[model samples]
Target: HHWGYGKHNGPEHWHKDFPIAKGERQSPVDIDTHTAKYDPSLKPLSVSYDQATSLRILNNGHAFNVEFDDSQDKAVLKGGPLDGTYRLIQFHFHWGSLDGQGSEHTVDKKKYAAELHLVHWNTKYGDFGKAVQQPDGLAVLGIFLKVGSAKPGLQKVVDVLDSIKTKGKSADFTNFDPRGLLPESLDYWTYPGSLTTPPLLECVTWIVLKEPISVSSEQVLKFRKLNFNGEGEPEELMVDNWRPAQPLKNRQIKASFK
Candidate 1:
């Protein structure tokens, strides 16, 4: 059976197939600012993405991904919570129905309309395939989406959603700069966590931004129309494809800003 955001195959029942579901270092944790210590040594995050590096946009059943041409360091993330350079792999979004609730990680227990995850792999490990299992392998940049203005350059991204409505459906979506989607401030919270999906390897260094980008309700509606099912089977809307907060355990969450 495939894992999904449904009752039977959801996060709660993931332990049946993945033992690491109950692992100590898990992701999408509720970031309690009170406990988050300010780290003066942590530098501001540096992101330089070449617009031409973006390749395609596809409906991956769980979330829609905008894969990049990571064959080279055309787009890379450095500083902040990373050591060396981490090449941009793929970026995706996780959303839900409610206007005030959906984002994976919470702040002060408050949820947002959606969340964006920019996945990257350590260049030191060669590539994503080889780095996924290593402890210091991945660096996932998370950004919350609050209900606000229509973010510029966002319409073009949503305009293609109708083209990729079904699972495995894809379209040529290139020459896009993902850096435009980032919030004004780069202040963030850093912690050791795991992937939010199945085979949830505890190999991620989570860098969740404190500020959020604008995403109106209309934009979210387009995402809800996306199907998790393929062309022939039954239609299942791809929504709430997010994991809830897991235990912080012995980990200490650090903040780049006070």
Candidate 2:
């Protein structure tokens, strides 16, 4: 059975099925800037995205994902804390039901309107499914989104939301570069963590950007309009689709900037 963001199936009960849900390196941890140690050795992130490789956008019931063709190294992420080249596979978002509270990860107990995850898998493992099982196989670049002026780059994504409003719905969304959505600064905090979703693989080397991108109130609300249920099933609006911050037991968060 699949898990969801409901009162019965939410994060609190996830450990019942996926034991790693309560593991030591769980994701979506609250980033305490006060306690983060500065690491001068962390390499600058190398992001090379090919707009032509963007395949389509799909509503996967959990969130809207912009997938890409990872057959080649057209779009690759390297440097930073990664060991090898990681191919960009897809990108998704975690948002809240209301304007003030939706991002999966927080900073100093402060939440953002949303969070964007650019998922990549290490080429050393060959495929994503196989890579996910290894200790150093996945790297997710997380970018926080704040509510303010509308972001032109994001508007390209928001424009297609109506088309993928229902679960299982998808539309051709190509020639769009994901890099355009990033903030000016690449300064970040790095840690070892698991996926925020099921299977909750503890294979991710999370690189959470310190700066936040901007989006309008109306743009943020568009995400809530998506449906968690597929056609023929009872309709359920997808909102508050973020896991709470987990315990950072025995782990240290390293910052790329002071």
Candidate 3:
């Protein structure tokens, strides 16, 4: 593979090929709540998912993703720092090897146990490819995962991991609802940012929820069992699959709540 979370090919080395890794608007930034500007104009995030449209679950060697059926707007995201309706394509998680640190974005320098990203693309721009190039193309709904009660929403996804334990492995996952993964509150902090991964394009409008959802320590441990090494290769644990917080350069982080 060209990139991974190893000492040799992790985020630090991504700039070699994808120089945009150091670009103006990289993602997974630290959200300093107190300093964030309270923007009353930002609308509440609007989202609706047809629970059954969830097609398959994939272990793409990086993070496992639960993809949706976007042929129609079975699941979509709108409002809150976006002018156009966006379709939910897939959702994935960024986590750490330990309980103290796994999330991609931090709140006032405090890292959460894990973070969830629901990736969507603007419908105005057509498919994922075309939308990715536009300035206001992607809208990633980010939710922090705290270590607490065992969340039933997360358990269903975790139970399917054994079938796709290695890179390039996937399973037929259906009847899954993405809505349950969210916290009770819809308040958020938003800013312009890029994809947190390779070829880090600066087309994202990040809408990060203020409240965090809880997950269990055992549930987090189950994620570590997945192999970074593909099938037939040696067993290398897939843990710490999160990028460090990038610099919050000349940008304003606007909040939906005071």
Candidate 4:
């Protein structure tokens, strides 16, 4: 399970739960638009789902992550899946101080309710670690999180949070499909960027969907309930798990279909 701490369990408290938290390229904060340059040529190639995908869920008690086993098939892109196979390594979420303003990706410097990330790697290049450094090696699809009817967007995940509700606890999940959670429209925004977290590798092709999924405050609290600290422990609970916004450097952000 993951650990966290803070007024609402902010970044400063999460470092201890997942030591890698410090090293991980965390996300969800707004990308400074003034500094972010939009480039069309750098747009990510289109990808198609030719085959059924498999998902494996890891319940680390406090939080959950879904890993897609795409070893058998790759997400075909611009030149036909890029000659290399890719497996969706895993997917997770990020939140903030309150349900209304917790997400990382911002529009007009405005934050979304939450954010979901689908992280993948191109097997053709090399191992994920090394491949994440190549322009075509990594592809991250970002979906915006809006506050609304939790029944629609998050019902699938909320159905299982009860299974792993405490820290240091973990469970395995199978037969789940991540695709089922995608919105009907594939229209999206694209850009050349790096991992949002540290060691910020500049090799990712970002595909951010235009329409956001809606969720309710109750569903959001499920994530807020997660804490690295056990009940009544010396350490405080981790409530708000998010990083401060990062600089866009010299990168460009673009929407694919728009």
Ranking of predictions according to lDDT: 2, 3, 1, 4
Q: Tens digits of per-residue lDDT for model 1 on 181-237?
A: 889899999999999998899999999999999987798889889998999889888
Clashing pairs in 2: 96-102
Report lDDT (CA) for all predictions. 0.91, 0.92, 0.91, 0.59
Whole-model lDDT, model 1: 0.91
lDDT of 4 at 234: 58
Per-residue alpha-carbon lDDT of candidate 2 for residues 29-67, written as tens digits (9 for 90 to 100): 999999999999999999888543899999988899999
Estimated TM-score for each candidate: 0.98, 0.97, 0.98, 0.73
Candidate 3: segments with Cα more than 4 A from true spot = none
Where does candidate 2 stray beyond 4 Å? none
Shift of residue 243 alpha carbon in model 4, Å: 2.1
